[PDB]
């Protein structure tokens, strides 16, 4: 139980250094850019949990980050405390938002359309259920359409806590669309980032305090059954998925103590794994990026566009390197 502790939370991991060649903090984000998503074209969608979503465009030498504005009726900006993201790029080429929502005491999905001349976002709607207790990432499969985590079971927060203190793992995955939700995976500890290869035949979920990410082969009928499964000696937090190879880019937290309970004398590190070749026997992982904060902190996910690596953080910076 003492020992049960200390292994999920790897109370005991400390990093050693991976480099990169040239990192450089995003001017402008300073207060979490806990998840982010790179459309074919470059621009970059970054969550930060005001709640805001915020753009870069990837393809400029130097990117800067600017706000996106969000119009319409049907969201209450002053709650809004965004969480994980997800885009959905219809057949003529509108591009949806799909954004895991906070707003004080419960969960929502909200959908937006992004529209790119005005740099702006357009609320469509706010997804509730009650399979959605406690959402933290999705990955759409269409407008309105994903497959989501729920990091906990309960929605009450001194619930929650108790619920990951006694190891539960409760924590399950949802398919959600508008005619038919169902849980489809069960059982996690701490079920967190979620993820879909390329071509739609698979979907990788992260399991957080078990350090292991799942690989389940996905159906026409949208069920999930269990292929693979690999462990790690780190937290495994969001996953990012290289369209063209497929690959896995994942960001990590090498030490749960520190970014449970946070400390500013001891703060949290940051950790980027990539993997390929994720159906064979021995799957390749490396180390891509690993340092203890002194540059940034918390990393929780990361991504890839023609040879820069972007990283974001629970509630810190962002970092853009070359690869
Ligand atoms: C599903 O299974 C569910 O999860 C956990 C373990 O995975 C089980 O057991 C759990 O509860 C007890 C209750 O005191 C904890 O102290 C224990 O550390 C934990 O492993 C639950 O009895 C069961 O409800
Ligand atoms: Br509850
Ligand atoms: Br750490
Ligand atoms: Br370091
Ligand atoms: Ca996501
Ligand atoms: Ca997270």
New binding site residues.
Partial sequence: ?KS?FQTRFNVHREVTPVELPNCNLVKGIDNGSEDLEILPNGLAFISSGSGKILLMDLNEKEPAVSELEIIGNTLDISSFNPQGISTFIDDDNTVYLLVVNQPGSSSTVEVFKFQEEEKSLLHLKTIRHKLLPSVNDIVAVGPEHFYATNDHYFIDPYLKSWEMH?????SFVTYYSPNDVRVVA??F?FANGINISPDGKYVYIAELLAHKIHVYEKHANWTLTPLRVLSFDTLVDNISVDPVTGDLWVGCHPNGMRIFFYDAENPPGSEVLRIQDILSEEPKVTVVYAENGTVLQGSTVAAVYKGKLLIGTVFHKALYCDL
């Fill in positions: 139980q049960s006694l190891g539960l793992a409760w069960e059982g500890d």
